Each structure stands twice: as structure tokens, then as C-alpha cells.
């Protein structure tokens, strides 16, 4: 579920959301802590979900790393509420 | 590793987005460009505060 009380975009056009986004700011969690130059790239699946690739520079490893995920809408694809599973 | 992903605000031209996770301890500002304007910055912060998010938790991510 979305957190109680929050807005969720309700005319979502997944096709126009596809491609690369820059992470400008985050609340810090151990899964992303220390990563700089973070991007998210979205593409459309045949089964109607999204493929996700999260990329960042890890200045400790001195390396680029990414994690890949599969996202599905929890309702109408015009409601921007999804669940993402990373693998 | 799995969880909710919610676009809570998005401008008309799909250039700027506020995304939250399964509760108010997860929030992200996304942009089509690596830097944003002071004006866009304050609108995003105003919206997050309005919906009960604690904007003091933001880390400003290094970008080229």
C-alpha cells in the first residue's frame, strides 16, 4: 500500500516515464549509503511491468555498480503505485 | 530486497518527480537533468513537508 494519506499520480503514462532519471536527493538507507552519481533507468516489459536498473559510483570500491529489478503496478497502470523486486 | 515505489508528484512534462517507498522513511527527488533549480528544489520540499515527510532526512547526492 502507499503510506496512509499521501498523493499518488492518478493519470500516470508509464511510456513517458521510461528512460534515465538522476537521483537529486534521498533519505539514507544501507542499500544506497555512500553511492554518488546515482541514476535510475526504466524500460517497459512485454508482461506490462517495468524493468529497473539503478546505477551509482562507489568511491570506496572506486567502481560503478548497478542492481536490477522487476516492477509491477498494484492496480491500474494510470495509478503510479508499484512493487519492485531486486535480483 | 523488495518494496513499494509510489510517484507522489510529477510535473506536466515528466521532467521532475517525487517518489516515496512503503512509508515516510523512504523519499527520493528524481530529475531528467543532473542538477535542478532553487525554485523546483523549494516546491519539492514544500510538497514533501505538506504530506508529513521530515525533509531534514534528505542527503543531496553528488552529480556531475
Numbering used by the authors:
A (entry chain A): 23 to 109
B (entry chain B): 112 to 175
Show passages lifted from the paper.
Lipocalins are a superfamily of functionally diverse proteins with remarkably conserved tertiary structure despite significant sequence variation. These ~ 20 kDa proteins form an eight-stranded antiparallel β-barrel enclosing an internal ligand-binding pocket. The precise biological function of some lipocalin family proteins is not yet clear, even for those discovered more than two decades ago. This includes the first bacterial lipocalin protein identified, Escherichia coli lipocalin Blc. Blc is a membrane-associated protein anchored to the outer membrane by a covalently bound N-terminal cysteine lipid, and it faces the periplasmic space.
However, we were able to determine the structure of wtBlc-split protein at 1.94 Å resolution. The wtBlc-split asymmetric unit cell contained three ‘split’ molecules that differ primarily in the area of the two β-strands adjacent to the split point. Two fragments of the split protein together fully reconstitute the typical lipocalin fold. During structure refinement, we discovered a well-defined positive difference density map area in the binding pocket of one of the three ‘split’ molecules in the asymmetric unit. Based on the shape of the density as well as previous observations including color of the protein, absorbance, and fluorescence spectra, we suggested the presence of the heme B molecule in the structure. The heme molecule occupied the same hydrophobic cavity of the lipocalin as it was previously showed for vaccenic acid. In the binding pocket formed by chains E and F of the structure, there are 19 amino acid residues containing atoms within a 4.0 Å distance from the ligand (Glu45, Phe53, Glu54, Leu57, Val60, Asn76, Lys77, Gly78, Ser89, Phe108, Tyr113, Gly114, Gly115, Tyr116, Val130, Pro133, Tyr137, Trp139, and Leu141). Phe53 and Trp139 form π-stacking interactions with the porphyrin rings IV and II. The side-chain hydroxyl of Tyr137 and backbone amide of Gly113 stabilize one of the propionate groups of heme by hydrogen bonds. There are two additional amino acid residues from the adjacent ‘split’ molecule in the asymmetric unit (Ser148 and Glu150 from chain D) that contribute interactions with heme at the solvent front.
